[PDB]
Amino acid sequence: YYTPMMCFQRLLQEKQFDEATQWINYVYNPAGYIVNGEIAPWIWNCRPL
Amino acid sequence: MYSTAVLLNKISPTRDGQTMTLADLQYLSFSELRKIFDDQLSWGEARHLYHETIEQKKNNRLLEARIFTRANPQLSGAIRLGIERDSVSRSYDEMFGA
Amino acid sequence: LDAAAGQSLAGQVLSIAEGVADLVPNVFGLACGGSRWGAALRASASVMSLSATASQYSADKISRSEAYRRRRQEWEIQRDNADGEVKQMDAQLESLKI
Amino acid sequence: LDAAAGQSLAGQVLSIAEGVADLVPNVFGLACGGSRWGAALRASASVMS
Amino acid sequence: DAFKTYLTRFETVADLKVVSAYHDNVNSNTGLTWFVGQTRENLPEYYWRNVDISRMQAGELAANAWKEWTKIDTAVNPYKDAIRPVIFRERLHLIWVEKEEVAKNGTDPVETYDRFTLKLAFLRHDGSWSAPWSYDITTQVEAVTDKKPDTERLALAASGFQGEDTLLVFVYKTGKSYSDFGGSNKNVAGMTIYGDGSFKKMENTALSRYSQLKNTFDIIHTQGNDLVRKASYRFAQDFEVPASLNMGSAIGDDSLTVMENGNIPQITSKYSSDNLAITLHNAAFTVRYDGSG
Amino acid sequence: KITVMAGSKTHTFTASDHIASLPANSFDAMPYTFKPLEIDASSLAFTNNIAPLDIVFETKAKDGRVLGKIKQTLSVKRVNYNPEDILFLRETHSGAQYMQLGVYRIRLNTLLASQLVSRANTGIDTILTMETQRLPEPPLGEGFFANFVLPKYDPAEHGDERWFKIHIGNVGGNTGRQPYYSGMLSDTSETSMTLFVPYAEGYYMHEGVRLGVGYQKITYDNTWESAFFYFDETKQQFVLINDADHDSGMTQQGIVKNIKKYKGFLNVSIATGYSAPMDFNSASALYYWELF
């Protein structure tokens, strides 16, 4: 959790919006996550959350 | 580890009395293909068919770009001296006209 | 500064060669041995340090070059401002003589 | 400059390894010994630098 | 001047000659081949690269299947050309042997002998190399070379037994052909290295187990004294089958139910006679009434 | 049930018979765990030393609703340490290192650095020329260069597609055809190529090595239809056996009477003293492109 969020924050501060989105989609994606070619059942990608 | 011809034969015919071809699967995602051919294909077979469809799509895109690059009239042209007309270029012209 | 970076990079082959040379035993007779077991490791650390120093010199050179370039850009802006002032005064002269 | 910092950090494992290697005796026969007693301490000082 | 410096670097890289290779597969149909190369100049500078030979089509390999030469910076000083890559724990390891001149203490006539040490390092995540594990293989080297390592070409082979998560390291005397290992065959010696760095010298019973690996040993050509190196190979008994399978999850009809935690933790293989038996242990999955939102 | 398919055999393990401990009947999570399932995978169809095993976890209700279906495939790889399928590295006396797998050889190193010094004695105007980029490379061990000329495209003779393939024959222990080269026929002019055919003592089987060309709708691999080559110990050179019709001719196994000329090729010859220029699709392609 803590490292992808830090990377996302730094990319957002530098205005690299696409890279920041890629780095925050490791934690949360409103569209879901593609596992084995299908949408995964979980809502959050960070398991402790 | 599979054969695309064998897999396409397992999936044929395409509701039209025609052999199922890689172009007809352009078209639908891997999950769609697995759902449609859940009874005829295994996981590895569906994955192989999906990958072959993707590679064929990429190859066709490359070929179209290759033809148009040489057909471009803007390179006519002092650069035209180092340009050759390919047999595939001639075949594309004879098929699709101008 | 470029020469300094080159001279820093020049010593790595000699460092590796010294590390290779110091591994050979150098005492003979009834007391043999004398090999420096850490010679190769020290040579590798030395070449790492020399690489760091060369990188620092090259970075300094490039930084000074870019500072000079930006300074020239600001000079160009000042030159344009002065030219515009001269033209504006040349127009004010026509107004004044009318 | 980033590469310079990386190259500076890259030598610490080698410094520690050299300090470990120089503690082994290197003269044999009827006159043994040869250990560099301060090799580990010098390695630690080098990694600090 | 900058171009001439570039040319110096180019000559250094282009003068590289391959010295050893490892194939990360049980057969030559897929996988990666990892090469270690050496410079022409009289330094112990070593580079490594790899190629994906699964791209081979009628013996033609595209240029993008190859990888750039990357320099190894870990103070490698091998004995002659006894340095080779190997892969175990899924990462690139470099294994070599060093020779030193040591004397036995407390002997009025000082007699010297060669001490042979096996060193093993691995490539870390950031591109740096670790501190090598060190083992003593003087007895094995002397046994395989008949105490004549100056006259005989000591050879090293390393293979990765992924099924047991171990590294099989053979030290042998380069010849024209090799017989089965263990027992009467004293030209091959074996060592087993574990994931934590510990080691166990192989005995006759375990050495006879890897006898089919002799086809990956360097041999001297019958027609003229020409050395023909051979790529080492990943080792498996007869069939390589994955040890587990995480099947995944699924969503049922009408978004009413979910199948979760489907996995086969243990998958074992047995090749007795000419029939293969595959056992799946503790295959489990959960069914739960749950819509995905 | 869990259903597994290994080649032609299909096993089904239902929860009535192969269940370890059946979960409590409830609407919450119900974990099903099975006993050790044994699979007789002795009929797996091994293509290129790898075979698939299909595993399906299925659960359905009485209504027919699929409570859950999970498909997966397991890859079983067959160990093949046969000496003819092992990659090996060799270095010729000219300095060329090659990696050989079966019949195919791949150049591993490059020797342009040695030749660049004399060029670099003058300016770089001498290094960066076409003459330098056309410098020949030493051959990959013992072998010969054969020149092939393939005709203009003719749909009547070749077929509806302009592609051609070249196959090699009596090499190693394989009498059958192995793909060696491929290309596309040119509809305006002939296609000329020069192939390096390897050699080793005892490598060529009876009558010598075959190189033949196939176009689909025809494959010129009957008797004496493909070009035959052999190594004559007397003259110490490679000779084409069927460059023309012969009532007798020397081959690898002595004198053979009925010799018919090769078919498919417009012309086949042996290029004496031919060294191919450096390759820009080789292992050193990146460095060549960066230099030039």
Added chain:
Amino acid sequence: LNMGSAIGDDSLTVMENGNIPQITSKYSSDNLAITLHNAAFTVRYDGSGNVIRNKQISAMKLTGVDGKSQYGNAFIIANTVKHYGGYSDLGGPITVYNKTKNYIASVQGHLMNADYTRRLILTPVENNYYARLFEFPFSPNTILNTVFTVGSNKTSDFKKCSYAVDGNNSQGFQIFSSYQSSGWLDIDTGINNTDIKITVMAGSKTHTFTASDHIASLPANSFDAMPYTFKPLEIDASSLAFTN
């Protein structure tokens, strides 16, 4: 010795890949012998990047009606050819006369419309349809680069027929494309083995090695690349004039 390349007369042919890979010496007794091994060079039909290459080379390269080939014949070509007019600028119908078989071979790059009937008119007036002297219909309508087999020795009329019209319709005139003539040239394609030779001169001695005797294997007779490779050529270099 990397001899290099050369360009022949009229920018019609190129000699390429000329090189002697091995040159050995033998100084026995007092005579010096120099041996050139595998002396090779390739002759090709090719123009130095102009209209002649793109058009006349392909015109002769087109297979003849009777027996394909068309190598070793005599041709009449034009020096410079330039577009005149019509509807657009197609590849331009450019004609080559095979004078030993009485052939017209036309070359073009594009076609305006497949539905419009097109043929070749050769006329010294261009815009005058009745003032023509050659009219050849395309056998397929949607095809280019065809040969026509006149039959008569109308070389004189062929030279008077400046221009070349690909339009050639009777629904008016309807010139699609038309090219020019300018000059005229006559070439022959046949080659002589006694004329394919390598001549060496060492001091006062001169030795000639022709392709009749010192050749290894002749190339395939074609308009494409023809590589000639010679046997080991032996030279008695014992009368070289040594200055310094």
Added chain:
Amino acid sequence: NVDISRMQAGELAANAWKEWTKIDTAVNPYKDAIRPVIFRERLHLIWVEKEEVAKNGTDPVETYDRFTLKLAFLRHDGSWSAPWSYDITTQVEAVTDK
């Protein structure tokens, strides 16, 4: 180096000569046994070094001179390579009669 092809009646122009350039590769030759040579079309420096070595495992410790032939070459950027080294003690003793 000098280009003596410019020699005319024993007179050499001053532009045919070349600047002295320092060799920096840790050269320690024995007496004056250092000389240049050109092979592989590039400048090589070849020399001999003498070291005092003793024979191990002899009760009367006897010392002898070991002669090593070293060979380095000049690289494209003006730096010198690491020398190859060979042992020529037998040849040196044979030609000098010990």
